[PDB]
Design an enzyme around this catalytic site. Sequence first.
Site, PDB file in Angstrom:
ATOM      1  N   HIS B  41       0.816  -1.213   0.000  1.00 56.33           N
ATOM      2  CA  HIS B  41       0.000   0.000   0.000  1.00 56.33           C
ATOM      3  C   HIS B  41       0.856   1.273   0.000  1.00 56.33           C
ATOM      4  O   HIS B  41       0.351   2.341  -0.351  1.00 56.33           O
ATOM      5  CB  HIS B  41      -0.968   0.001   1.196  1.00 56.33           C
ATOM      6  CG  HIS B  41      -0.319   0.347   2.504  1.00 56.33           C
ATOM      7  ND1 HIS B  41      -0.015  -0.601   3.460  1.00 56.33           N
ATOM      8  CD2 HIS B  41       0.098   1.534   3.007  1.00 56.33           C
ATOM      9  CE1 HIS B  41       0.564  -0.013   4.495  1.00 56.33           C
ATOM     10  NE2 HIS B  41       0.639   1.284   4.248  1.00 56.33           N
ATOM     11  N   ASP B  88       0.030  -7.700   1.755  1.00 54.82           N
ATOM     12  CA  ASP B  88       0.458  -6.299   1.728  1.00 54.82           C
ATOM     13  C   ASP B  88       1.982  -6.241   1.789  1.00 54.82           C
ATOM     14  O   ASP B  88       2.585  -5.807   2.768  1.00 54.82           O
ATOM     15  CB  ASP B  88      -0.180  -5.541   2.884  1.00 54.82           C
ATOM     16  CG  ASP B  88       0.003  -4.035   2.771  1.00 54.82           C
ATOM     17  OD1 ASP B  88       0.446  -3.563   1.696  1.00 54.82           O
ATOM     18  OD2 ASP B  88      -0.329  -3.341   3.748  1.00 54.82           O
ATOM     19  N   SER B 173       4.234   2.578   8.195  1.00 59.58           N
ATOM     20  CA  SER B 173       3.941   1.588   7.153  1.00 59.58           C
ATOM     21  C   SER B 173       5.214   1.101   6.486  1.00 59.58           C
ATOM     22  O   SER B 173       6.127   1.884   6.206  1.00 59.58           O
ATOM     23  CB  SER B 173       3.037   2.171   6.066  1.00 59.58           C
ATOM     24  OG  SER B 173       1.694   2.229   6.476  1.00 59.58           O
ATOM     25  N   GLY B 174       5.265  -0.200   6.226  1.00 61.58           N
ATOM     26  CA  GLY B 174       6.397  -0.786   5.549  1.00 61.58           C
ATOM     27  C   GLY B 174       7.581  -1.117   6.429  1.00 61.58           C
ATOM     28  O   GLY B 174       8.511  -1.777   5.951  1.00 61.58           O
TER      29      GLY B 174
END
Lengths: 98, 218
Positions: B41, B88, B173-174
């Site tokens: 994402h 994801d 995120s990530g």
Amino acid sequence: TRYVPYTIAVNGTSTPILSKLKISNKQLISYKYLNDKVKSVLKSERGISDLDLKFAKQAKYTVYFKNGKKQVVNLKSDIFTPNLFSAKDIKKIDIDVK
Amino acid sequence: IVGGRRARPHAWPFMVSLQLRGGHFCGATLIAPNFVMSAAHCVANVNVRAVRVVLGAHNLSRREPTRQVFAVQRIFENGYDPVNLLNDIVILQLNGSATINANVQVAQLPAQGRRLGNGVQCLAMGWGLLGRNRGIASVLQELNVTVVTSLCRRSNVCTLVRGRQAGVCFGDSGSPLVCNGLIHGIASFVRGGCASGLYPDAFAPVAQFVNWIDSIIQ
Ligand SMILES: *[C@@H]1O[C@H](CO[C@@H]2O[C@@H](C)[C@@H](O)[C@@H](O)[C@@H]2O)[C@@H](O[C@@H]2O[C@H](CO)[C@@H](O)[C@H](O)[C@H]2NC(C)=O)[C@H](O)[C@H]1NC(C)=O
Ligand SMILES: *[C@@H]1O[C@H](CO[C@@H]2O[C@@H](C)[C@@H](O)[C@@H](O)[C@@H]2O)[C@@H](O[C@@H]2O[C@H](CO)[C@@H](O)[C@H](O)[C@H]2NC(C)=O)[C@H](O)[C@H]1NC(C)=O
């Protein structure tokens, strides 16, 4: 500051005006930030409050990015991806409540 | 990261900052000298050419000579589903190979299919917001978290800081979840806002993709 075009459709009905919302380009933004901006215009321009959205059948917006990509955000969801993005990449926002 | 502490400088030399012209937007993990791993994402809607991959960083507000900066040549995914936030995970191939030194090192991954049980102690990390209404971190942050199986789903690794409003936040995120020295998670989504103290954070389950990851990086 950046002024992002947006449209509001309520129960299938859309209006012919051109409107823009003020978004900060001072730092990268989140979808939590964008939710608050979208909810701000739903409240001011349509009288649809945060709690009203809890009872709506559907409440979403779509962010159109200038590269042709898009992201659909569900306003009834409290699940967020913890990423940042640039407000300068936003082409327009289509807000849709039923 | 909300409620964490500063990492020691270059304590996690596999940690990567993905940046736009406007700066840090997601974390990643160095998984080979020419490959990093992040959340799908994070890059789904960005132009690959706009991404700068920053290795060897600690304080994003400094001009650090330890840094090596790469561009992204292409991305690899494996069934990312934006509606259900499944799979994801993305691999970004760099436009070159990092030089491995004290400050830039390749992470170690678990074996395929390894599952973490309820109560395993892990470390989350990243440069995301220091609080729900705060800006992104300058210094890399880390946070002791515990794996939980309640309020999760089998498609994710979920973690919690029991009794505290602490967890990942925007910009994390990530970023990797490290358990027993291995990367078991990639920060994927939060529930109830950041650091709710009510719901665990969800990580993409890296061990389910190890076979796939190995085929891309060989
Ligand atoms: C691999 O790419 C790096 C990074 O390129 C910069 O970041 C990209 C996202 C893109 O925006 C590029 O236009 C940027 O230049 C290259 O490093 C750059 O190299 C040029 C030429 O030597 C130099 O003028 C820049 O200052 C460098 N930028 C940084 C941040 O170091 C690098 O040369 C590329 N490597 C190979 C082998 O092609
Ligand atoms: C908070 O976490 C640190 C680090 O956790 C370990 O290292 C991570 C990278 C990951 O692999 C986790 O799964 C590990 O549990 C803990 O530091 C460790 O503490 C023990 C006992 O004091 C020590 O033997 C180790 O050397 C330490 N490891 C490192 C890398 O420093 C710390 O104990 C945790 N604190 C609490 C209260 O849980």
